Structure 1
Amino acid sequence: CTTPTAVAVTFDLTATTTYGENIYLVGSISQLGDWETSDGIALSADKYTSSDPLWYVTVTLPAGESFEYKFIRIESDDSVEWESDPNREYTVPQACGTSTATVTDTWR
């Protein structure tokens, strides 16, 4: 069991986008580069294609916390768009072994 205070949280997008862009994700703590989209983290679409568009990235989050993370529209470069106003949040639990978490980021 690694850091019991850190939980991996996957941020998934409900977005059937079809462009060559990518939805990155930054956060309210250094874990997500503090608040930089070019330092945040690009997400992937392994569970997103046509039937169910679900992006997501399991960005670790050390020290239980109602972290506040949001999405960003990142072009083939660091140019992007970002959180509307109401960003998202996650509460890192204190479970040893099952260090998993969830954050439903919507992009569509």
Structure 2
Amino acid sequence: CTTPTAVAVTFDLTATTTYGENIYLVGSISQLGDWETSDGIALSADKYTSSDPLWYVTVTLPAGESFEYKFIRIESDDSVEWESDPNREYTVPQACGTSTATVTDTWR
């Protein structure tokens, strides 16, 4: 059993946008570049604006262990305000199940 090795997690975040920007999910994982949004988890507006006013998301992480989950909110001024105030710890278990959960939050 090694087919399901990714982690589909749905994240959401109420922080409004401006048809141009991205609110991400940088969690500490090899594919979740928590410390380089280049591989965290961006959120956008498929229904909302073009950028992302409700900041929703559904990405997959190829891993199965403890992962840090810091959040970063990239604005339209090209500048990530790595929301590092709060914090999350997705312990994705390496099994045939329990490899996809939620990850909701919001901006203060």
- Which sections of structure 2, spanning at least 5 residues, go unmatched? none
Deviation (angstroms), 1:57: 2.5
CA distance 1:18–1:28, shift in 2 (3 Å): same
Q: CA RMSD in A?
A: 3.9
Decide whether the 8 Å contact of 2:22 with 2:44 is kept in 1.
Answer: yes
CA distance 1:91–1:54, shift in 2 (3 Å): farther
Select between 43-52 and 80-89 the one with higher mean Cα deviation: 43-52
SS for the counterpart of 1:34 is coil
How many residue pairs get matched?
Answer: 108
Measure the CA separation in 1 of the matches of 2:75 and 2:30. Answer: 22
TM-score after normalising by structure 1? 0.65
CA distance 1:80–1:89, shift in 2 (3 Å): same
Decide whether the 8 Å contact of 1:25 with 1:37 is kept in 2.
Answer: yes
CA distance 1:95–1:77, shift in 2 (3 Å): farther
SS for the counterpart of 2:31 is helix
From the two aligned structures, give the one with the greater strand fraction.
1
Select between 42-51 and 81-90 the one with higher mean Cα deviation: 42-51
Decide whether the 8 Å contact of 1:2 with 1:97 is kept in 2.
Answer: no
CA distance 1:46–1:29, shift in 2 (3 Å): same
Deviation (angstroms), 1:81: 0.5
